[PDB]
Amino acid sequence: SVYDAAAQLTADVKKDLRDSWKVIGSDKKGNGVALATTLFADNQETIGYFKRLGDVSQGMANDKLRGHSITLMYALQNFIDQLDNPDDLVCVVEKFAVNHITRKISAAEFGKINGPIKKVLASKNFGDKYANAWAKLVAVVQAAL
Amino acid sequence: SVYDAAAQLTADVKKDLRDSWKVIGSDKKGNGVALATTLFADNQETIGYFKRLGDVSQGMANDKLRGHSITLMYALQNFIDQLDNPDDLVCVVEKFAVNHITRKISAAEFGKINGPIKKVLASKNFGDKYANAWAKLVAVVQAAL
Ligand code: HEM
Numbered sequence: 001s002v003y004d005a006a007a008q009l010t011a012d013v014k015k016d017l018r019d020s021w022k023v024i025g026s027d028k029k030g031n032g033v034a035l036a037t038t039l040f041a042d043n044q045e046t047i048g049y050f051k052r053l054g055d056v057s058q059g060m061a062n063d064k065l066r067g068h069s070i071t072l073m074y075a076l077q078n079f080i081d082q083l084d085n086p087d088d089l090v091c092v093v094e095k096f097a098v099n100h101i102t103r104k105i106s107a108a109e110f111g112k113i114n115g116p117i118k119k120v121l122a123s124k125n126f127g128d129k130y131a132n133a134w135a136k137l138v139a140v141v142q143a144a145l
Numbered sequence: 146s147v148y149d150a151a152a153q154l155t156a157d158v159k160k161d162l163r164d165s166w167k168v169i170g171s172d173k174k175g176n177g178v179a180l181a182t183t184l185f186a187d188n189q190e191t192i193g194y195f196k197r198l199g200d201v202s203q204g205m206a207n208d209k210l211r212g213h214s215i216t217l218m219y220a221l222q223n224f225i226d227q228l229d230n231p232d233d234l235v236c237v238v239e240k241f242a243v244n245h246i247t248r249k250i251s252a253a254e255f256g257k258i259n260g261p262i263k264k265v266l267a268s269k270n271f272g273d274k275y276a277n278a279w280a281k282l283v284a285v286v287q288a289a290l
Pocket residue numbers: 046049050052053068071072073074075076096099100103105109110111112113240243244
């Protein structure tokens with residue numbers, strides 16, 4: 001199933017993911033925080049999962065939130081690095097899903113991250129072409145939830 | 146405390162961490178698996194915490210072990226990347242400590258990774274000077290457990 005979702009990651013999709021990540025991943029703290037705060041802004045209900053982070057309205061200045069946002073970017077870094085080897089991509093995605101499954105985060109709930117990603121990409125001038133490529137990567141993760 | 150331990154990362158310690166990581170981090174899968182397998186071999190008592198991974202002796206052939214090993218290296222990548230900013234290093238270490246605290250991994254238990262790190266470093270011609278620098282970084286995590 002995850003192997004099948006990974007099949008949608010064509011040469012063109014992997015190329016756009018890599019090119020866009022070259023920029024997005026160059027500032028993990030700034031964009032990581034951008035992603036997290038955008039998620040909470042567009043889907044306030046997702047905040048229910050982050051009680052531990054405390055006052056998320058503080059954004060960047062919130063040490064726990066900042067700590068989570070930076071760390072989040074390294075999971076994406078991991079995924080991008082494994083793109084050329086489906087066997088490694090799959091084992092890394094399934095490993096990643098373990099804790100999110102335990103948190104009872106469904107594929108549908110996880111899919112809510114697509115909006116914030118599209119926005120973060122757009123702030124760096126990466127159009128729909130790139131947003132669609134990223135949604136396909138997220139779909140691989142969704143297949144594991 | 147974690148804030149006092151982070152202050153122990155002096156100029157040269159950070160430099161040695163970077164120079165050695167430049168090589169060790171070049172092959173996250175190979176070195177990540179070597180690190181994990183060495184831990185289980187030298188400290189079989191720690192295998193109990195990794196029941197979900199299955200037969201850990203299969204090494205590279207064990208998909209779950211390979212997934213965990215690769216992912217492990219990205220946490221180290223994170224720490225190295227935050228060396229410039231103590232505030233970020235700390236929030237990233239505290240974030241990392243959460244799940245390990247939940248598994249009841251004590252500071253003394255975590256410290257068992259020092260052996261495997263020393264050996265992997267040694268396999269790449271990096272001596273005690275470097276093993277000691279890494280022990281200091283590990284001490285930062287131990288302070289948060
Ligand atoms: C592309 C999107 C995402 C990435 C790359 C990502 C990455 C991560 C990483 C690396 C961690 C730390 C390791 C762990 O505990 O699993 C984490 C923690 C967590 N994630 Fe995800 N995640 C994503 C989306 C989501 C979404 C959509 C939710 C829920 C609506 C979610 C909820 C959580 C929670 C609650 C934690 C624990 C936070 C804490 O207490 O520090 N994640 N995630």
